[PDB]
Write a protein that binds this ligand. Sequence first.
Ligand SMILES: Cc1cc2nc3c(=O)[nH]c(=O)nc-3n(C[C@H](O)[C@H](O)[C@H](O)COP(=O)(O)OP(=O)(O)OC[C@H]3O[C@@H](n4cnc5c(N)ncnc54)[C@H](O)[C@@H]3O)c2cc1C
Length: 462
Amino acid sequence: QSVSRAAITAAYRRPETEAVSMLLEQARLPQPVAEQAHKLAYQLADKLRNQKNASGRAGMVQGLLSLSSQEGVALMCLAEALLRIPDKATRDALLIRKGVDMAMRLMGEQFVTGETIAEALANARKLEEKGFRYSYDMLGEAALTAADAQAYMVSYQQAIHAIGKASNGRGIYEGPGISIKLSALHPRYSRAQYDRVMEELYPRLKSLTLLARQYDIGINIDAEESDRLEISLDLLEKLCFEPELAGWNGIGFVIQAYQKRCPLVIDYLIDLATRSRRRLMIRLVKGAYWDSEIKRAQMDGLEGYPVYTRKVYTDVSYLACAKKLLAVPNLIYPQFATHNAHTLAAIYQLAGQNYYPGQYEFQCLHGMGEPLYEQVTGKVADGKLNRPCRIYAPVGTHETLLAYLVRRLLENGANTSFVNRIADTSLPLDELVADPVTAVEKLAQQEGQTGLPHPKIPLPRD
Ligand SMILES: Cc1cc2nc3c(=O)[nH]c(=O)nc-3n(C[C@H](O)[C@H](O)[C@H](O)COP(=O)(O)OP(=O)(O)OC[C@H]3O[C@@H](n4cnc5c(N)ncnc54)[C@H](O)[C@@H]3O)c2cc1C
């Protein structure tokens, strides 16, 4: 393997104390930057939470209470009835499968942009008028048969034609793009071998990428489970050297900060952009498959996890990786995917003075990020930050929704998730937007060393 490929492999399941200790001084915000990130994060999270005055209203409720909850309700029901007395004088003087299917569809609706690419493309004008951008995700993954993969191929091809016509020359930055999953383009990808992936999957990836280039829209390769990282790099490496793609910078690639390999993957990507003479569109995410990654490692009984076991470590990893990406704007267009107010504010500060549109963009999932990003994308005059956000827009029917929805349920329902915590009016804003580096050092001082694994998540062999 090349030097940078070797380093990736060696870091696969690096001990957490060692990986976190390494990332820490790379992720640490210089003092004035930390202060500004904190102030901005606090302000974003304050507006997000208290837009319709949720905390003030909760603090009138508690302030009334000397009664019980359900009691105070009884009173309000009465006070409401009294306020419906028109005249104040009078007032004063006085099966299992189908249950799961329905619940999925009902909870999943909010995360879906449209049933078909045409409906999706139509629902996007409203936010596009405001400076938002889109990346369309034709739902459907883990193709089991040759036929399934073929259908996904056809669906992607048709989406590119529709998106590309809608883009009408706006280009890879200002115009919409598409996101694809490699698992959709090859039967039984989860266990597919190198030779068959190259022989069958690659011609599909190349074909779609060339079509995306013809319309000049971005084409992003989503990141999936950790044991597919390697083959996805081999596929990316070959793609970047196609003569037909020379001089074109619309190839996009996701990297997952929850993996120990992430910074090493960045070193590889930097070298690849250099050798293949292009700017790569790189989406930095934390990661969508954490629960399954943990479970898989525990069943396979290997020496360690390929992901961090404490959420704060992933946050620290994201910040370190963000700095690495921002240091090479000639080689990488970073796309910072997050719904976390601190993370956003930190990136905003880390990106430095003198923003220009092609420096970087934020990204968010449809149904999750719009309220936060409504403070971000737009004009300074309107009280926004004037930073563009690209909305990830799932497209498809109920038959294609299950796996995506489950990942959204895990993301939204986890007590460690920012989106879950901000919805807790009890949890103070300062804790919500607490600096992850400082949080890691707190743990270290309490525990006896830096980057210990989650106490409840022993090594697979233990
Ligand atoms: C536009 C967009 C595209 C994305 N594309 C992909 C993709 O192609 N592939 C992919 O894997 N993910 C992808 N993601 C990420 C995933 O879908 C989540 O949205 C993202 O991880 C949430 O991060 P955060 O900064 O919003 O939230 P936060 O609440 O800040 O962070 C939550 C994340 O922390 C991580 N985490 C949770 N618990 C632990 C723990 N105990 N130990 C270590 N880490 C933990 C998980 O990654 C979790 O998602 C994408 C996200 C966005 C917004």
